[PDB]
Amino acid sequence: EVLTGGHSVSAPQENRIYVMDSVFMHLTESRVHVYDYTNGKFLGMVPTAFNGHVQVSNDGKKIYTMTTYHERITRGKRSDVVEVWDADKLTFEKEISLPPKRVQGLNYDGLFRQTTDGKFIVLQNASPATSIGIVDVAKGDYVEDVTAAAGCWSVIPQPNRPRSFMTICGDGGLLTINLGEDGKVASQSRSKQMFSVKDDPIFIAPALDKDKAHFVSYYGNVYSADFSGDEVKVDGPWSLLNDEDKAKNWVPGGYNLVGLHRASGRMYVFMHPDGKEGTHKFPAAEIWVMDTKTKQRVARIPGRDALSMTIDQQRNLMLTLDGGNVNVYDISQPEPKLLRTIEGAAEASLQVQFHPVGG
Amino acid sequence: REVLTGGHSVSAPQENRIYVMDSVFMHLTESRVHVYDYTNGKFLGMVPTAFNGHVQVSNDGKKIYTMTTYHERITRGKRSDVVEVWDADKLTFEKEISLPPKRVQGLNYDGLFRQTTDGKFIVLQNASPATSIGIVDVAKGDYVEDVTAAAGCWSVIPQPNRPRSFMTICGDGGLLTINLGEDGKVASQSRSKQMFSVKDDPIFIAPALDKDKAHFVSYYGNVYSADFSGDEVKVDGPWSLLNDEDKAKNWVPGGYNLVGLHRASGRMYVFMHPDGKEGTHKFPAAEIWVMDTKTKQRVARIPGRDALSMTIDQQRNLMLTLDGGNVNVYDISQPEPKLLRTIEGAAEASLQVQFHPVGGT
Amino acid sequence: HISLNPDLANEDEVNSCDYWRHCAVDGFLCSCCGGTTTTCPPGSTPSPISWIGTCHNPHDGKDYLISYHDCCGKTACGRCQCNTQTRERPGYEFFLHNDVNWCMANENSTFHCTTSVLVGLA
Amino acid sequence: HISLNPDLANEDEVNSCDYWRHCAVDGFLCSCCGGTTTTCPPGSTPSPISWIGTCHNPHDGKDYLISYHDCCGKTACGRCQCNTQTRERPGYEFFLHNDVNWCMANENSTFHCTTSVLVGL
Numbered sequence: 001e002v003l004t005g006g007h008s009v010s011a012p013q014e015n016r017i018y019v020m021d022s023v024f025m026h027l028t029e030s031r032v033h034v035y036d037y038t039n040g041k042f043l044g045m046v047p048t049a050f051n052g053h054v055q056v057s058n059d060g061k062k063i064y065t066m067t068t069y070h071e072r073i074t075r076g077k078r079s080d081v082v083e084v085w086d087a088d089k090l091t092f093e094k095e096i097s098l099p100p101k102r103v104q105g106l107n108y109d110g111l112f113r114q115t116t117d118g119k120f121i122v123l124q125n126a127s128p129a130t131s132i133g134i135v136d137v138a139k140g141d142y143v144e145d146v147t148a149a150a151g152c153w154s155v156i157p158q159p160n161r162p163r164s165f166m167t168i169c170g171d172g173g174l175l176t177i178n179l180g181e182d183g184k185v186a187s188q189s190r191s192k193q194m195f196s197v198k199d200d201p202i203f204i205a206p207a208l209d210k211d212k213a214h215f216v217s218y219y220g221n222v223y224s225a226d227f228s229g230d231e232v233k234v235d236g237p238w239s240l241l242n243d244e245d246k247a248k249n250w251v252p253g254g255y256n257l258v259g260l261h262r263a264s265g266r267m268y269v270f271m272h273p274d275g276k277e278g279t280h281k282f283p284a285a286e287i288w289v290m291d292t293k294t295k296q297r298v299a300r301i302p303g304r305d306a307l308s309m310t311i312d313q314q315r316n317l318m319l320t321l322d323g324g325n326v327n328v329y330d331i332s333q334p335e336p337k338l339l340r341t342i343e344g345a346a347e348a349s350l351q352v353q354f355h356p357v358g359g
Numbered sequence: 360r361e362v363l364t365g366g367h368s369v370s371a372p373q374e375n376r377i378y379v380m381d382s383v384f385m386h387l388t389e390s391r392v393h394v395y396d397y398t399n400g401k402f403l404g405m406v407p408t409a410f411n412g413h414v415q416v417s418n419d420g421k422k423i424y425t426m427t428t429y430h431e432r433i434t435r436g437k438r439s440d441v442v443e444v445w446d447a448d449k450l451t452f453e454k455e456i457s458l459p460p461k462r463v464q465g466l467n468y469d470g471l472f473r474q475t476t477d478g479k480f481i482v483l484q485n486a487s488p489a490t491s492i493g494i495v496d497v498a499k500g501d502y503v504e505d506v507t508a509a510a511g512c513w514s515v516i517p518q519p520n521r522p523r524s525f526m527t528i529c530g531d532g533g534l535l536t537i538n539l540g541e542d543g544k545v546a547s548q549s550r551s552k553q554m555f556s557v558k559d560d561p562i563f564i565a566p567a568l569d570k571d572k573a574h575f576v577s578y579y580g581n582v583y584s585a586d587f588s589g590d591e592v593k594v595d596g597p598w599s600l601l602n603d604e605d606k607a608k609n610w611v612p613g614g615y616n617l618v619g620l621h622r623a624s625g626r627m628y629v630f631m632h633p634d635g636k637e638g639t640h641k642f643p644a645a646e647i648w649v650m651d652t653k654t655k656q657r658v659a660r661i662p663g664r665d666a667l668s669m670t671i672d673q674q675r676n677l678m679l680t681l682d683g684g685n686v687n688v689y690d691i692s693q694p695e696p697k698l699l700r701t702i703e704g705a706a707e708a709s710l711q712v713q714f715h716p717v718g719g720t
Numbered sequence: 721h722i723s724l725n726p727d728l729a730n731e732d733e734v735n736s737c738d739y740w741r742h743c744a745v746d747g748f749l750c751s752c753c754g755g756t757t758t759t760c761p762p763g764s765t766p767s768p769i770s771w772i773g774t775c776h777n778p779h780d781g782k783d784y785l786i787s788y789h790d791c792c793g794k795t796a797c798g799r800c801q802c803n804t805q806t807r808e809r810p811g812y813e814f815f816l817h818n819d820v821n822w823c824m825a826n827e828n829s830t831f832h833c834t835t836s837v838l839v840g841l842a
Numbered sequence: 843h844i845s846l847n848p849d850l851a852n853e854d855e856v857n858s859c860d861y862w863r864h865c866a867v868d869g870f871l872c873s874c875c876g877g878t879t880t881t882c883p884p885g886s887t888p889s890p891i892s893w894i895g896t897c898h899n900p901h902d903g904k905d906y907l908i909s910y911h912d913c914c915g916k917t918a919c920g921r922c923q924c925n926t927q928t929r930e931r932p933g934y935e936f937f938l939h940n941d942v943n944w945c946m947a948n949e950n951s952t953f954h955c956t957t958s959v960l961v962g963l
């Protein structure tokens with residue numbers, strides 16, 4: 001026998017999920033673990049140094065990471081980068097230099113995103129002044145710094161436009177940025193106030209439809225941003241809660257805590273009872289399933305202490321993640337059905353993502 | 360009302376301090392040294408040591424020496440093997456000394472990263488995989504050169520009765536002695552007669568080190584010695600650790616830094632386990648045996664607490680043992696050791712603990 | 721009041737995530753990491769910036785402004801991890817947010833530990 | 843036949859530290875890490891050097907030389923850690939010794955996982 005390298009991941013792209021392991025206890029050795037959701041098999045990994053973030057290219061061909069190096073880890077010159085990796089060979093291809101202010105923080109989806117057309121990576125900076133950085137993937141260059149987004153946070157791509165995204169601002173409204181084909185800002189707009197920052201703060205995680213996004217609040221309200229037109233129209237609140245729910249102080253909690261099943265309009269939200277100040281990141285006691293058209297709950301199931309989720313539209317799946325274990329659910333019908341749990345998928349993960357299949 | 364400040368020194372005095380080298384094998388690129396107070400189990404600080412760090416304290420107790428490997432992008436880019444000099448009281452980085460890119464990467468046996476008795480040279484093991492010993496002039500901050508004469512040998516046993524001499528164990532079953540000049544280059548060398556059969560009675564590399572002799576235990580529970588009181592090393596053994604009852608239950612040594620010598624008494628400490636056979640030489644200790652090296656008799660046996668590595672302090676008459684995660688502190692001023700406390704959760708994956716030096720001139 | 725002076729308190733009390741001033745900590749308490757509530761462990765560097773929390777002191781009945789400064793430039797301490805969230809808000813209220821590394825602007829941004837510095841009455 | 847071809851055997855058997863050819867592994871089994879017994883996980887690089895074990899095959903009753911080549915250049919796999927020591931010897935018999943990183947000579951020496959390559963009888 002002879003040991004060989006150069007091999008590709010053994011399972012098809014459509015089976016693959018990406019568990020971003022912060023390894024917070026040893027945060028300089030964060031990594032992405034690649035699993036097959038159909039059988040729980042470990043398929044490989046991508047090292048991501050200090051507090052890595054990850055996404056898969058919309059065309060499914062590449063993995064993008066964002067990380068920070070120093071010449072001697074704990075001393076020496078800093079290099080913030082995006083790396084491009086081949087998705088099948090799990091090999092490094094290209095480093096793209098960033099200014100030394102890429103967001104260091106927990107793995108909310110909205111900190112490291114891409115345009116719908118896949119041509120630009122859109123990432124959050126904090127120095128601690130905030131701005132949004134644009135990377136041209138083809139050119140391998142940082143091409144734009146959106147200072148218009150100062151005082152805003154996170155990136156919500158618009159799936160109905162090729163190079164548009166929104167961010168949540170300190171006024172409780174949204175800033176929309178439309179990039180040109182060069183990755184520079186081509187236009188922008190600001191919505192009216194959607195939510196009261198002080199009185200009903202929203203979680204940043206969107207329940208994202210093709211042409212609208214829903215957001216849940218610390219107190220269990222729902223707000224929406226409709227981007228069917230060039231100007232975003234905002235609305236809300238409606239309550240997730242009926243009177244019985246209110247009596248037991250049910251509120252949302254988690255990190256990447258919501259999801260939307262686009263074909264049905266069902267929104268999935270992690271909820272826990274006995275809500276009060278300081279419980280907004282509590283593990284889920286339940287997952288609630290909301291009909292966003294009727295603005296009413298349709299189902300509730302045990303939450304398995306989950307903190308983060310993600311949805312696959314085309315296979316009608318939901319993953320949930322409790323920090324270490326990934327639960328796989330069929331959401332083809334209104335009540336989710338638990339298919340399996342992948343134990344020990346990470347030591348400290350708050351983000352799981354499917355390999356894109358939609359092109 | 361309050362202001363957060365840095366620049367502070369370790370809160371407990373040097374004589375209270377121990378160093379637990381945490382390989383963090385599960386995340387080996389973030390190895391580190393954990394500094395503890397052995398008198399009360401308090402965590403005092405830490406020194407980051409990147410990929411598979413090794414550590415020692417300067418003989419004069421002023422500095423911590425680490426040895427590690429960096430790459431420009433960790434898993435890719437140019438390699439830099441280094442020794443780093445850190446201030447012991449401030450736990451701050453002072454100096455990097457460049458090594459050739461072949462410093463030993465491996466588990467934390469003491470003999471892979473040592474220093475001459477006079478403290479002037481760091482003496483470290485290289486493997487490319489060809490083996491050689493590297494010499495670092497600490498004050499100059501220079502790598503002197505490779506001791507290529509040590510090819511086919513392994514590990515560094517300083518001679519405590521000479522200022523800049525050490526030995527290494529060679530594949531012929533003998534010892535090579537290297538004597539350095541004031542510049543750190545080899546001034547002379549000598550090779551002993553065969554001490555042990557590599558095939559039939561392999562020894563553990565960890566020495567039970569006296570001022571002028573070293574004892575070694577074997578996979579089968581024999582003891583060998585190398586006496587360096589004269590100008591050439593005289594070798595001897597085996598004598599057996601085992602009596603008939605011991606042999607009948609197949610007691611053998613096991614562990615990593617698995618032996619120690621209390622120099623004033625001649626007591627040798629060894630981790631042992633029953634039902635020995637091929638493949639059990641790194642098993643956790645079922646017991647610690649205490650041997651009188653003069654009488655060649657066992658004088659005590661106590662529970663092993665699954666320990667794998669130990670260290671002895673001659674100045675306070677102490678033994679630490681370490682099971683990978685927890686440190687046990689023993690008083691060894693009498694033949695039977697007395698357990699004082701256990702420091703739980705000192706490391707995730709450590710095979711080496713060391714005292715901060717007190718005295719020792 | 722004694723409740724304002726952690727160095728006079730029992731170490732087990734201050735090293736607990738339930739200690740009143742640690743009400744918005746996401747990190748390892750520096751007092752468990754070889755430092756104290758207001759001093760970085762040896763060889764780690766205070767952050768010049770921080771997230772801020774308002775914490776209730778049940779011992780004197782008053783509310784206090786706390787600045788959560790990190791100590792930086794050493795790898796994760798790993799001891800006394802807390803994740804408390806009283807009055808913590810998302811990144812659109814950036815200086816009330818604790819899911820970001822407040823070592824981010826240090827000479828070396830590696831996160832070591834966090835603490836809770838008393839600013840004054842809220 | 844079957845005892846010499848792990849790709850055809852039961853994965854739960856091959857991914858166990860008790861599998862006969864893993865008799866001197868100090869590391870994470872590559873077959874648990876997205877690879878197989880003789881192939882590196884994607885994006886990790888074989889080591890050209892190794893420690894060697896002599897392992898007993900309990901099916902055919904013969905002893906075989908196994909070469910423990912590492913896969914390198916990715917951070918620790920963390921799965922199926924083994925620490926078996928049959929016929930392992932200290933560093934003065936260097937190529938029988940498994941307490942050193944057999945990735946030490948690779949372009950990137952970061953240790954990912956260990957493979958158990960069958961050399962022959």
Ligand SMILES: *[C@H](O)Cc1ccccc1
Nearest residue numbers: 105106747819820821822
């Ligand atoms: C303390 O600074 C919070 C934190 C969050 C994410 C990464 C590192 C530190």
Ligand SMILES: *[C@H](O)Cc1ccccc1
Nearest residue numbers: 465466869941942943944
């Ligand atoms: C496998 O190469 C053994 C090993 C030992 C010590 C560090 C890293 C790997």
